[PDB]
Amino acid sequence: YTSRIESLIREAQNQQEKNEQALQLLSGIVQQQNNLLRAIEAQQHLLQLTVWGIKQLQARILAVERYLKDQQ
Amino acid sequence: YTSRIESLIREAQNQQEKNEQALQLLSGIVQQQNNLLRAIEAQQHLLQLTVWGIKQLQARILAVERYLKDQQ
């Protein structure tokens, strides 16, 4: 879970409209590119946690699969 | 699963070449930034579903782990 990614998505949304209405535009485009980068970084942190969480589940289910096989 | 993210990736790909060949460029750069934002939003929706799906699995495997412990 991360609500920061949501806040970054809305922040790039506001910066996008300000660029579209202005189309100082170069500063809003550079500022917009920093917003997208922060969101990509925030997603990669959450995407990294989902990778570690999938590995944990694969180890937990394999321990159960091997347990039910050893009982026989 | 989401095939929309793929379509958005190809759409930013076409807009990238049009900007690289043009390098009206400001409009293609603003249009490109909206494409990347849509893809980031589409990935966050899929990344959100993968978070809920991992929690469900952790509850399902914990129910099985506790079941095999209660049987003893």
Next chain:
Amino acid sequence: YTSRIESLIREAQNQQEKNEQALQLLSGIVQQQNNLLRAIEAQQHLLQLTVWGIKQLQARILAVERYLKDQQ
């Protein structure tokens, strides 16, 4: 796992500072937009693998859930 996404995040980080200090800027902005696109594509590949991995776990845990029900 993918360390390429990390390298792409740092590469967009270096390009962001070069754009912020320059604020030839148009070329750095187009070059920055290609960096973010590569990272979005690299995350979607990893996000796709996490989707296939969650489906596999759901099938493995359902096989165990059905096994413990058939034993009764």
